[PDB]
C-alpha cells in the first residue's frame, strides 16, 4: 500500500 | 543532534525470540509525524527494510517477515523495540534502527513533506549471530602447495567470532591474506589465511592462530610436504 | 512487490572522476527516493532525500535527479572517502525497499588471478572431513567465478567462498573458496578441480590434482 505521506 | 543506538543479545539460538532495543536522544516519538524504522544487513549483503513505527502509533512491517515481527514504542523512555520470533540462521545480520523526519511545519501547519522521504539518521548497528553452537576452538590444518608459491592455514570449526591469525609471530606481513570467515551450515565458522612468497623462499612459515573465546592458541608451521 | 534495480552493481573509478549511479523502480515512486553512501564497517549515511534535495552537511559534489521510475546520483569529483557502496531507497510504497547497492572501488589495470588448489591435509582426513581449498590471488576487477569439479561432475551446494576487501596498495582482491566433503565421499573420487573464470583470463583456467597420487 501507499506510504504514510501519499495523497 | 539526533543519535540512535541499538542494544540486545549478540548471539541467539534458532527458534528463539530476539528482542532489539533502539534508544535515542534529540527527538521525541511524540513529535509530529516522526518515525523510527529498523533495517538489517546480513554480512556481505544488501540492506533489507524490516519495519517502522510513527509517533501517532501507526506500524508497518515487511510482508516477508510480518508474522515474526512486532514493533512497539515506549515514548517516555525514548525507545523503540523490535521483537522477532522464531529466528533461524538466515536472520544473522547487523540490525540498524533509524530516524525518519515528519513533515516540516510552519506555526504548526504541515507545509513540506519532502523531508520524510529518507531515513536521515542511523544508529551504529548491532551485530546478531544466530547459531545453536556452543563456544568452541578451531582445528588448524595446513594448506600446502609471477612464479609465486602459496601456502596457508585453514582455521576450521570454531565459535563464536573472532579469531586472530598472524604469520611468523607477526614478522611476515607482505603477501598475507586472511579471509573473512564463513558461517557454515553446522553453525561454526571457518576461515583460511594464506601467504604468497617468491617460489624460492620455500625461510620457514608458521601461522599463529588465537581464538580468545575458547582459550585456544595454536602455532602451525606449514611446509612444502613430500617429507 | 516493488522492485528497485541499481546500475551498475559495481563500478571502478579514480579520485577526481565524475560518476553516476542509477536506480530504476518497477512502478512509479514519485519523488520519494533517497540515496545513501555506506563505508565499510559503518552505517549508511543519507546523501540525498526526496530524489534531489541535498541533505544538510552533505558535500555539494553529490547530486540527485529524476522522479517516477528513474533516478540518478552523481558525484561530480570523486574523493577518497567515496570509495564505498551506495544504495537507493524508495519510500512511496510499503515495504520501503532498498536497491541492491553499487560498489565503487579504486580502478587499476586488469589483473588475472594467480590460482592455487590445496588438497585436504592428512590430519583433517583422520577426523573424517575433507576440505579442498582454491585460492584466487591478487586479481581485478572483483568479479570472478569459481566452479568445482570432481571427476568431471559439476559441484553445487557444497562450497563457500569469501573475498578480501580491496588492497590499499595493490587495488586487487583475493578470493578463497572451500569445497567440503566427507572423508568417505572424498575417497570415492580422483580428480579435484577448481575452474576459474575472470576478465583477465583469455579463457578459464583450471588447477587440479588427483587424490592419493604420491
Structure, explained:
- The complex is a heterotrimer of chains A (7), B (227) and C (214).
- Chain A is mostly loops and 7 residues long.
- Chain A has no helix or strand.
- Chain B is elongated and about 80 Å long.
- In chain B, strands 2, 4, 5, 6, 9, 12 and 13 form a 7-stranded mixed beta sheet that branches. In chain B, strands 14, 15, 17, 18 and 19 form a 5-stranded antiparallel beta sheet that branches.
- Chain B folds into 2 domains: 1-132, Immunoglobulin-like (Sandwich); 133-224, Sandwich (Immunoglobulin-like), CATH 2.60.40.10.
- With 214 residues, chain C is mainly beta.
- In chain C, 5% of the residues lie in helices and 50% in strands.
- Chain C has 2 domains: 1-107, Immunoglobulins (Immunoglobulin-like, Sandwich), CATH 2.60.40.10; 108-211, Immunoglobulins (Immunoglobulin-like, Sandwich), CATH 2.60.40.
- Chain C starts with a strand and ends with a strand.
- Chains in contact: A-B, A-C, B-C.
- Chains B and C meet through strand 5, strand 12, strand 14, strand 15 and strand 19 of B and strand 5, strand 11, strand 12, strand 15 and strand 16 of C.
- It is classed as immune system.
- Keywords: Fab complex, HIV-1 Neutralization, gp41 Peptide, immune system.
- It forms a trimeric assembly.
- Crystal structure of the HIV-1 Cross Neutralizing Monoclonal Antibody 2F5 in complex with gp41 Peptide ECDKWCS.
Amino acid at each position: 500500500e501507499c506510504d504514510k505521506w501519499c495523497s | 543532534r539526533i543519535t540512535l543506538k541499538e542494544s540486545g543479545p549478540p548471539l541467539v539460538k534458532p527458534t528463539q525470540t530476539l528482542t532489539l532495543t533502539c534508544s535515542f536522544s534529540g527527538f521525541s516519538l511524540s513529535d509530529f509525524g516522526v518515525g523510527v524504522g529498523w533495517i538489517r544487513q546480513p554480512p556481505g549483503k544488501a540492506l533489507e527494510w524490516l519495519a517502522i513505527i510513527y509517533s501517532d502509533d501507526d506500524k508497518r512491517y515487511s510482508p516477508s517477515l510480518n508474522t515474526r515481527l512486532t514493533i512497539t514504542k515506549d515514548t517516555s523512555k525514548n525507545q523503540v523495540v523490535l521483537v522477532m520470533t522464531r529466528v533461524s540462521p538466515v536472520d544473522t545480520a547487523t540490525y540498524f534502527c533509524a530516524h525518519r523526519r515528519g513533515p516540516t511545519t510552519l506555526f504548526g501547519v504541515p507545509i513540506a513533506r519532502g523531508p520524510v522521504n529518507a531515513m536521515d539518521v542511523w544508529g551504529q548497528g548491532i551485530t546478531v549471530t544466530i547459531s545453536s553452537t556452543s563456544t568452541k576452538g578451531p582445528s588448524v590444518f595446513p594448506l600446502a602447495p609471477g612464479a609465486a608459491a602459496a601456502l596457508g592455514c585453514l582455521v576450521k570449526d570454531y565459535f563464536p567470532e573472532p579469531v586472530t591469525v598472524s604469520w611468523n609471530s607477526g614478522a611476515l606481513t607482505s603477501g598475507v591474506h586472511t579471509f573473512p570467515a564463513v558461517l557454515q551450515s553446522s553453525g561454526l565458522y571457518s576461515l583460511s589465511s594464506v601467504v604468497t612468497v617468491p617460489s624460492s623462499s620455500l625461510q620457514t612459515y608458521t601461522c599463529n592462530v588465537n581464538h580468545k573465546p575458547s582459550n585456544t592458541k595454536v602455532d602451525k608451521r606449514v611446509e612444502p610436504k613430500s617429507c | 512487490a516493488l522492485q528497485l534495480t541499481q546500475s551498475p552493481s559495481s563500478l571502478s573509478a579514480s579520485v577526481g572522476d565524475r560518476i553516476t549511479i542509477t536506480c530504476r523502480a518497477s512502478q512509479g515512486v514519485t519523488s520519494a527516493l533517497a540515496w545513501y553512501r555506506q563505508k565499510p564497517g559503518s552505517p549508511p549515511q543519507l546523501l540525498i532525500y526526496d530524489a534531489s534535495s541535498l541533505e544538510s552537511g552533505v558535500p555539494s559534489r553529490f547530486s540527485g535527479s529524476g522522479s517516477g521510475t528513474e533516478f540518478t546520483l552523481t558525484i561530480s569529483t570523486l574523493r577518497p572517502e567515496d570509495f564505498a557502496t551506495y544504495y537507493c531507497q524508495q519510500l512511496h510504497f510499503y515495504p520501503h525497499t532498498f536497491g541492491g547497492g553499487t560498489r565503487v572501488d579504486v580502478r587499476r589495470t586488469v589483473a588475472a588471478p594467480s590460482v592455487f588448489i590445496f588438497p585436504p591435509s592428512d590430519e583433517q582426513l583422520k577426523s573424517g572431513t575433507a576440505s579442498v581449498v582454491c585460492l584466487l590471488n591478487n586479481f581485478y576487477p572483483r568479479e570472478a567465478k569459481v566452479q568445482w569439479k570432481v571427476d568431471n561432475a559439476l559441484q553445487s551446494g557444497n562450497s563457500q567462498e569469501s573475498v578480501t576487501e580491496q588492497d590499499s596498495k595493490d587495488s586487487t582482491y583475493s578470493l578463497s573458496s572451500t569445497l567440503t566433503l566427507s572423508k568417505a565421499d572424498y575417497e570415492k573420487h580422483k580428480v579435484y578441480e577448481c575452474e576459474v573464470t575472470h576478465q583477465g583470463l583469455s579463457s578459464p583456467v583450471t588447477k587440479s590434482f588427483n587424490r592419493g597420487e604420491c
